[PDB]
């Protein structure tokens, strides 16, 4: 289970250091409502026997994805490139930011270790923006 300190810090960092989620674009109370919505936080269990599997890919190469994810915990790698280069990244690295706007994914995000991430859909994002336009 994710601790409240991690969730709140993810709210802070996500609000300030990410373009689409800035408090002017989406109000703070409604960002918390969007994070608190069910299925926004998802946990993945790593299978050691089958390291490469369809479940381990959070983003698949050249296939569509409509949502933005910010990784709170675990270790992950990105396989994207023309040469198929691979980089290792860790907690609080966000992927799929412009997929929220009105997306074939060139980047491949695969789970290296047990990770805990948040998934924010384009529908959730735009609807949350509309609710943010409500006085708040």
Residue numbers in the entry: 545 to 646, 694 to 727
Task: Reproduce text from the manuscript describing this model.
The Cyclin and CBS domain divalent metal cation transport mediators (CNNMs) are the most recently identified proteins involved in magnesium cation (Mg2+) transport across the cell membranes. The four known members (CNNM1 to CNNM4) encoded in the human genome are integral membrane proteins with strong homology to CorC, a bacterial magnesium/cobalt efflux protein. Structurally, the CNNMs are complex multidomain proteins that consist of four independent domains connected by linkers of different length. The intracellular region is directly attached by a long α-helix (H0) and comprises two distinct domains, a Bateman module and a cyclic nucleotide monophosphate binding-like domain (cNMP domain).
Crystallization of the cNMP binding domain of CNNM4 was only possible using a CNNM4cNMP construct without the C-terminal tail. Our final CNNM4cNMP model was refined to 3.7 Å resolution and shows an overall fold similar to the CNBD domains in, e.g., PKA, cAMP activated exchange proteins, cyclic nucleotide gated (CNG) as well as hyperpolarization activated cyclic nucleotide gated (HCN) channels, and also in proteins containing CNBD homology domains (CNBDH) such as the KCNH voltage-dependent potassium channels. As in these proteins, CNNM4cNMP features a central β-roll surrounded by helical elements at both its N- and the C-terminus. The β-roll contains the so-called phosphate binding cassette (PBC) formed by strand β6, a helix turn (αP), and strand β7. The first striking difference is the unusual length of the loop connecting strands β6 and β7 in the PBC, which is approximately 50 amino acid residues longer than in related proteins. This anomalously long loop, disordered and not visible in our crystal structure, is conserved in the four members of human CNNM family. The second unique feature in CNNM4cNMP is an abrupt turn of the polypeptide chain at residues 601–603 that distorts the otherwise canonical strand β2 and redirects the Y603 side chain towards the interior of the cavity, thus blocking the required space to accommodate a cyclic nucleotide like cAMP or cGMP. Second, the base of the β-roll in CNNM4cNMP is occupied by a network of bulky residues (Y603, Y694, F698) that form a hydrophobic pocket along with residues L602, I613, V620, V622, and V700, which sterically hinders nucleoside binding inside the cavity. An analysis of all interfacing molecules in the CNNM4cNMP crystal structure also suggested homodimeric assemblies, where the intersubunit interface of 617 Å2 is mostly hydrophobic and involves residues E627, M629, F631, Y639, M642, and Y694. Interestingly, mutating the interface residue F631 to alanine yielded mostly monomers, highlighting its relevant role in stabilizing the dimer via π-stacking with its counterpart.
